[PDB]
Scaffold this motif. Structure first.
Motif, mmCIF file in Angstrom:
data_model
loop_
_atom_site.group_PDB
_atom_site.id
_atom_site.type_symbol
_atom_site.label_atom_id
_atom_site.label_comp_id
_atom_site.label_asym_id
_atom_site.label_seq_id
_atom_site.Cartn_x
_atom_site.Cartn_y
_atom_site.Cartn_z
ATOM 1 N N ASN B 155 103.729 0.968 38.480
ATOM 2 C CA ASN B 155 102.489 0.317 38.875
ATOM 3 C C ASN B 155 101.465 1.434 39.206
ATOM 4 O O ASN B 155 100.281 1.342 38.818
ATOM 5 N N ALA B 159 98.043 2.616 37.186
ATOM 6 C CA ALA B 159 96.759 2.717 37.881
ATOM 7 C C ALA B 159 96.146 4.074 37.623
ATOM 8 O O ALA B 159 94.935 4.161 37.427
ATOM 9 N N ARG B 160 96.950 5.151 37.600
ATOM 10 C CA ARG B 160 96.428 6.487 37.287
ATOM 11 C C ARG B 160 95.891 6.544 35.860
ATOM 12 O O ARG B 160 94.832 7.093 35.613
ATOM 13 N N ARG B 162 94.749 4.066 34.058
ATOM 14 C CA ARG B 162 93.521 3.302 33.958
ATOM 15 C C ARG B 162 92.322 4.038 34.603
ATOM 16 O O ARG B 162 91.214 3.973 34.106
ATOM 17 N N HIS B 177 92.164 -1.317 30.046
ATOM 18 C CA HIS B 177 93.510 -1.865 30.095
ATOM 19 C C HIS B 177 94.434 -0.890 29.387
ATOM 20 O O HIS B 177 94.087 -0.351 28.323
ATOM 21 N N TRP B 179 99.003 0.356 29.605
ATOM 22 C CA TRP B 179 100.276 0.205 30.289
ATOM 23 C C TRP B 179 101.111 1.456 30.136
ATOM 24 O O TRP B 179 101.308 1.938 28.997
ATOM 25 N N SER B 193 99.507 1.120 21.794
ATOM 26 C CA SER B 193 99.070 -0.103 21.107
ATOM 27 C C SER B 193 98.365 -1.091 22.000
ATOM 28 O O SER B 193 97.654 -1.972 21.506
ATOM 29 N N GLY B 194 98.585 -0.997 23.301
ATOM 30 C CA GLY B 194 97.992 -1.939 24.252
ATOM 31 C C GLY B 194 96.726 -1.465 24.950
ATOM 32 O O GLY B 194 96.147 -2.198 25.772
ATOM 33 N N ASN B 196 93.087 -0.927 25.591
ATOM 34 C CA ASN B 196 91.946 -1.688 25.104
ATOM 35 C C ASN B 196 90.870 -1.894 26.127
ATOM 36 O O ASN B 196 91.147 -1.821 27.306
ATOM 37 N N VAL B 261 100.737 -10.013 36.519
ATOM 38 C CA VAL B 261 101.635 -9.159 35.752
ATOM 39 C C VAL B 261 101.453 -7.702 36.223
ATOM 40 O O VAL B 261 100.343 -7.201 36.224
ATOM 41 N N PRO B 283 106.307 -4.960 32.040
ATOM 42 C CA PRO B 283 105.350 -5.854 32.729
ATOM 43 C C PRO B 283 106.103 -7.094 33.242
ATOM 44 O O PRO B 283 106.696 -7.849 32.448
ATOM 45 N N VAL B 297 107.127 -6.649 25.595
ATOM 46 C CA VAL B 297 106.113 -5.838 24.891
ATOM 47 C C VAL B 297 106.720 -5.443 23.552
ATOM 48 O O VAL B 297 107.907 -5.063 23.508
#
Ligand SMILES: NC(=O)C1=CN([C@@H]2O[C@H](COP(=O)(O)OP(=O)(O)OC[C@H]3O[C@@H](n4cnc5c(N)ncnc54)[C@H](O)[C@@H]3O)[C@@H](O)[C@H]2O)C=CC1
Ligand SMILES: NC(=O)C1=CN([C@@H]2O[C@H](COP(=O)(O)OP(=O)(O)OC[C@H]3O[C@@H](n4cnc5c(N)ncnc54)[C@H](O)[C@@H]3O)[C@@H](O)[C@H]2O)C=CC1
Ligand SMILES: NC(=O)C1=CN([C@@H]2O[C@H](COP(=O)(O)OP(=O)(O)OC[C@H]3O[C@@H](n4cnc5c(N)ncnc54)[C@H](O)[C@@H]3O)[C@@H](O)[C@H]2O)C=CC1
Ligand SMILES: NC(=O)C1=CN([C@@H]2O[C@H](COP(=O)(O)OP(=O)(O)OC[C@H]3O[C@@H](n4cnc5c(N)ncnc54)[C@H](O)[C@@H]3O)[C@@H](O)[C@H]2O)C=CC1
Ligand SMILES: NS(=O)(=O)c1ccc(Cc2c(-c3ccc(F)c(F)c3)nn(-c3nc(C(=O)O)cs3)c2O)cc1
Ligand SMILES: NS(=O)(=O)c1ccc(Cc2c(-c3ccc(F)c(F)c3)nn(-c3nc(C(=O)O)cs3)c2O)cc1
Ligand SMILES: NS(=O)(=O)c1ccc(Cc2c(-c3ccc(F)c(F)c3)nn(-c3nc(C(=O)O)cs3)c2O)cc1
Lengths: 331, 323, 331, 328
Positions: B155, B159-160, B162, B177, B179, B193-194, B196, B261, B283, B297
């Motif tokens: 988590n 956050a880092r 993002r 966004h 992950w 791939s995630g 965005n 999530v 997630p 995922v």
């Protein structure tokens, strides 16, 4: 075109100043508690941090930045150079030496005055219209010092003062009565330190005077020894310092409370360090805590608290002790 | 009559707290979790536990002195776990920060059965490192079902990520966004791939994203997720604020039954060709019963292999542990 | 097979009881202002709405649900059937009928009794352990009515009472003094509305009694006409009803503040309506506002305010009038 | 000698974060309460042409001041009460009249804007304008033309609410909070909006890639119904309670948060889109925009299918055609 270019169309590239910037000077235990508390109250759009220890400063800044996803303060900066502080609305000074076990706050004067001689002119240079909120000890003496050095009008130089002592008093009163501190009213005034004054005559719950109900309240003849509540307020720092080495969380919350009133122009009343000349016959330029209306121009008004003759004598003794120190300082 | 009885007429005289949280270990991390949870009004009672009795009392008193400024009416502490009874959520931050892993396992052998005694239906949130291994240890010792044992995991790493993505793009992290999954720390996996903004895949826009040949070296963003932590430890000695906020965010989802999530560490045997009892971050949907569901995922071959290497590594260590 | 199952692996399907549920009965302007205020204070994990008007009810529910992204209350439900209210910690009653032109107070109260005979048993069926917070007017009488019908202990039946009147008083005091209402203390007790009692002895800033400074405060000898502050507490409500048709925002905020104290077990003091038999020489089962300590079991304690002879006579006169109506009600 | 002066010793004889709401119907007042409960302003001003309702609403909010942290709430029909606003939110609208044409209603709302906007500009020439009133994309154009403001400072609520509803509906299908359900509705507010299926995801997992029929007529799960329910659920609320208010008010407060706190979050709001998607005319449509203290500073160039682009182009054509028919 880079990825950013392909993703994002720029309408304008203009640098705007922050609207609600806060600086904290000193990123020690107190400065970081003030910082986190201010961040979690969404009071600032930019937070700047200053210290002299460069590695610690950068680390603290980074640690807060890593939490940005969970905050609403979009720019957190730091530096040893005060240019990072420019255009602050509020500058909170937490730098300096703290009490060791059994030391008085009054033993910190030389150390902390000589720090202020460097800090304050640098703050004023970069934020000439800020409010200064002094936390460093001894806070009443250092508020006087910051006022003298800054050249600011005294409404803009505010000591954290007895906001914390009063919060401690209300906590202890709540514990005795089984009521939340929010509904327990009572003021501790004067020095943030050994000479503070409990205003027994104003203590109340729901506007019911506790001294009227219990005429011996606060006296030596009191069977319930309410004076021990004030003694516990005085001894608070010393106990917590003995147990954990320093205090941080309560002062961080207290400072954030003061910052809320200033930043949001609330005109709430808080006991904070200010010039008391003209009240209670005091003639000297002494700074200590009385209840003040706080808002966007700092202290706009003082509440003239009615004191008993004993309460007033104790406040004047606190003023004498502080003025004894404040009068010998060299600028 | 006392002053209290003169002032106050009592109508009613035993209360069970309704929204209680315990933090075990009042070091820098545990106290950052505590202040963050206090300032988010998540609990009606906060309990603190440690083995250093003076430090513990001092931390408790310092928080109590701020009670006027909070909306959590009861703050308690003690070395004895009776103080923790009836907690909804118990957060373990106690530690040191193979012999060293075993020393944190040794602490868990004492802590976990004491927690379970006094709050048998709590959710356990493990923060102590190495967090994926210690989440496994807490699961084994507690005997709790998998839904009620959650590692803080990635988590914080996410956050880092993002934050660093937002810094590159000039967008708040809330709107960036991406992950980071797998093991917390060095071996974490960025799922390119995630990544965005506004549902626009950065990998589709810039197919070299994350690769060695990327002219813009977006792989550096993930390198900095790993390395910025070690930098904070070098600069200030430890990390505290970001983890505290991360933990409070998890606590919010759990306490408020949000079904948000989060990439937290969960027992993942049976997914991604993982065949051992290990905890890795994926997630997870978090709410009042802990992890109720998780998101499957779609991973590349390379990403699946990295999770499998991590599970082999974790399992290697875990089979040597004595508890 | 389904997209949901391709995307999400389910760990357990255990049926959950909500932990911090609130119901609002009656989705007129007041019920909906209560709802939005409670939602924006993150007090509940489930909010249930009930009314007899089915279309309006569903539309209000849906509109709130459409805002879910912005809230932290994950389930919002509604229906005419009380099954939607099950396991509520707090049930807020805003339903009732408004007085008609030329209708007696006794007739109006009896109509609301009849409506409460429908509502209250169904609330109790589904939330036997809830606290009831009655907002519907006439609030002091309907709190008694809810207490009689429910069979609940006194601590779990609370009338919103003078909590709003006191907030109006503190606003108006603040406007005169130039101080935020948070720092202006003063209490309006007794009957909500027309017959409420301003306790002038408790009016203070920073523990300084206004009545001590200005002995004519509140009397016809007062050149500053502070009695007009209390006249406006009463009249400003009628004025809002004349201007917009009803009141909603302030009552909604005040109810959310009560709910906060109850849901978080704060033990803050609020002037709410409670069964006062045995105080101030009151002999009958009547409910009037006094300062009460509010927490997770409702009203646990109350403050015994010292009242002047005139203040006590006003409370007794109110008790007489309320009991005179109550004794004629048909349950 | 006054009690005030006995009590208080005065040391010192403009607001810094002021917001105005113009139009105090259900929408305006929902925006107001939401903004008050989020502590976004130090001064809130309300304006309407109905003087009694206006004063009553103001008073009712003031009576709740003890519970708020916004120390000044003012109102009036005169725009002097709005001076020095950072953000001015327009929720004013004409009342539908039985038998009037759609174009007539639009022109009546245009006439309202002809009176409001110059008055807003006179007293807060440097504010951000946030347009909520419908038809929102047209009226945002109108406010831009009348105000003479730069495009970063004229923002329409647009598809901000539509997207919120979409995420709600998606969350209901998947059993996940809407915070964790991502998806964008762009273009025109209401019936002609465009669901961007390619961007629908949970945890960065594309639902379209998992379920290639997503959003098509072939789809056994009829995910197209999620988008249809966005506008249909709106009209259902209007049928049921007469109007919509709470969701719009919450979504407007979220926009106001990003602007007042300079957050640079992304929201699908209506902005002057000429030069994107082969759009050649001066029209406002919703795309994801970065919002902060200067309004819209940047926008995101979402990759659209040919069919999605053609829908936005058809909307632009329609809007420009109407804008030519309006008098202002
Ligand atoms: N007013 C009140 O109620 C309270 C006041 N305090 C006072 O707060 C002050 C700070 O205490 P802690 O944070 O615990 O100490 P600390 O030792 O943790 O931190 C002090 C920081 O000040 C920095 N500093 C020293 N000289 C400086 C300079 N010239 N410029 C910028 N930064 C400089 C140091 O490098 C250090 O990071 C002390 O004076 C303490 O007594 C502490 C608690 C309550
Ligand atoms: N999962 C994550 O992302 C992160 C995890 N951490 C981890 O958090 C943990 C704590 O870090 P810090 O607070 O900096 O360490 P610290 O040394 O300041 O505090 C650890 C506390 O645990 C206490 N403790 C030791 N044995 C105990 C027992 N048997 N019962 C109760 N308390 C006990 C200690 O007395 C001490 O007060 C470390 O394992 C650290 O690596 C830190 C940052 C991020
Ligand atoms: N205590 C206080 O300080 C205040 C109290 N009030 C009172 O709040 C009450 C509500 O006021 P408004 O919302 O303006 O009135 P309203 O008339 O708009 O709303 C009342 C709602 O109650 C519903 N209702 C009626 N019978 C019902 C039943 N059997 N079951 C469920 N719902 C039922 C109605 O259908 C309606 O939607 C009034 O009695 C009013 O005087 C208002 C303001 C302040
Ligand atoms: N963009 C969006 O997603 C949404 C927009 N809306 C729109 O919000 C607007 C307001 O909706 P309601 O509050 O239900 O309507 P309403 O008709 O109840 O309120 C409009 C208010 O505007 C006032 N007004 C009219 N002319 C004025 C002028 N010259 N100056 C100042 N105020 C004036 C009216 O007197 C009235 O109080 C409508 O245009 C509606 O379509 C509503 C929901 C969603
Ligand atoms: N996948 S695994 O569970 O096997 C695993 C997890 C973590 C680590 C390395 C590790 C350790 C650590 C500490 C004590 C130990 F006894 C130990 F084995 C490891 N702390 N730490 C930190 N992270 C931060 C931060 O803010 O991110 C502050 S400390 C970090 O990244 C290795 C393996
Ligand atoms: N002590 S008692 O229970 O007998 C009692 C309570 C209240 C009143 C006067 C009264 C009434 C009322 C309504 C229907 C009736 F049949 C009736 F007799 C009175 N509504 N109301 C309102 N207050 C507001 C506001 O925002 O304050 C909006 S409405 C108010 O002040 C009298 C007696
Ligand atoms: N792209 S455009 O500007 O030309 C355009 C915008 C909107 C509409 C339809 C429309 C209108 C509307 C109102 C008055 C008019 F004069 C008018 F032309 C249209 N209100 N409305 C509402 N939406 C809600 C809600 O809660 O979503 C409550 S009302 C809605 O969906 C058509 C075209």
């Amino acid at each position: 075109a880079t990825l950013k270019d392909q993703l994002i169309y720029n309408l304008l590239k203009e640098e705007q100043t922050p609207q609600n910037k806060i600086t904290v000077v000193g990123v020690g235990a107190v400065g970081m508690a003030c910082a986190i508390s201010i961040l979690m109250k969404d009071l600032a759009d930019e937070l700047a941090l200053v210290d002299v220890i460069e590695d610690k400063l950068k680390g603290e800044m980074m640690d807060l930045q890593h939490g940005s996803l969970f905050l609403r303060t979009p720019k957190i900066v730091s530096g040893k150079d005060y240019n990072v502080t420019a255009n602050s609305k509020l500058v909170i000074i937490t730098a300096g030496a703290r009490q060791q076990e059994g030391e008085s706050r009054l033993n910190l004067v030389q150390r902390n005055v000589n720090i202020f001689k460097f800090i304050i002119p640098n703050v004023v240079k970069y934020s000439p219209n800020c409010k200064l909120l002094i936390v460093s000890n001894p806070v009443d003496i250092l508020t006087y010092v910051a006022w003298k050095i800054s050249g600011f009008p005294k409404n803009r130089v505010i000591g954290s003062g007895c906001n914390l002592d009063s919060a401690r008093f209300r906590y202890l009163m709540g514990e005795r009565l089984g009521v939340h501190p929010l509904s327990c009213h009572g003021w501790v005034l004067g020095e943030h330190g050994d000479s503070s004054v409990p205003v027994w005559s104003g203590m109340n719950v729901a506007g019911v005077s506790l001294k009227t109900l219990h005429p011996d309240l606060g006296t030596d003849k009191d069977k319930e020894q309410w004076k021990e509540v004030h003694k516990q307020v005085v001894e608070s720092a010393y106990e917590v310092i003995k147990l954990k080495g320093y205090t941080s969380w309560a002062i961080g919350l207290s400072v954030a409370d003061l910052a809320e009133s200033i930043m949001k122009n609330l005109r709430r009343v808080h006991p904070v360090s200010t010039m008391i000349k003209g009240l209670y016959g005091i003639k000297d330029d002494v700074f200590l805590s009385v209840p003040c209306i706080l808002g966007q121009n700092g202290i706009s008004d003082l509440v003239k608290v009615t004191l008993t003759s004993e309460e007033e004598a104790r406040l004047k003794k606190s003023a004498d002790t502080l003025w004894g120190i404040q009068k010998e300082l060299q600028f």
